[PDB]
Write a protein that binds this ligand. Sequence first.
Ligand SMILES: [Ca+2]
Ligand SMILES: [Ca+2]
Ligand SMILES: [Ca+2]
Ligand SMILES: [Ca+2]
Ligand SMILES: [Ca+2]
Length: 145
Amino acid sequence: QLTEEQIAEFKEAFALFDKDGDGTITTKELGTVMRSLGQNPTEAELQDMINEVDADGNGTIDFPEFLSLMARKMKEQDSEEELIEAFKVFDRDGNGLISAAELRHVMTNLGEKLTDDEVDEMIREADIDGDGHINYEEFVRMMVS
Ligand SMILES: [Ca+2]
Ligand SMILES: [Ca+2]
Ligand SMILES: [Ca+2]
Ligand SMILES: [Ca+2]
Ligand SMILES: [Ca+2]
């Protein structure tokens, strides 16, 4: 499941939070890590963050809990990065929007020679804000559906 080196890496990450090395991250120690990086969440906000990760409902995060989450997160990241890469290719001019001209061009490079009507239908179907283009959120919402 994990190598010793992965474990060690994860333990080093856990230690950043576990300011006192007691084997748990509290809402308070989370507050320290958030603050050091420029956020100042309320105790209510910290409690939600801990509650979302705290499996045994004991109020703090232990290493198996942290390890479990970071496996989740690292999957999510590999999913996301792929969606983002693909979007950026589709958006040839980098402007955050995939125009129909871009979509047609890249489809031609993917083996499909489409008409303007066909590509306009693809865009209509997926467009949410009405602008006749596809932004990242729109792009993701279609891809994962
Ligand atoms: Ca601690
Ligand atoms: Ca806040
Ligand atoms: Ca716990
Ligand atoms: Ca574009
Ligand atoms: Ca749009």
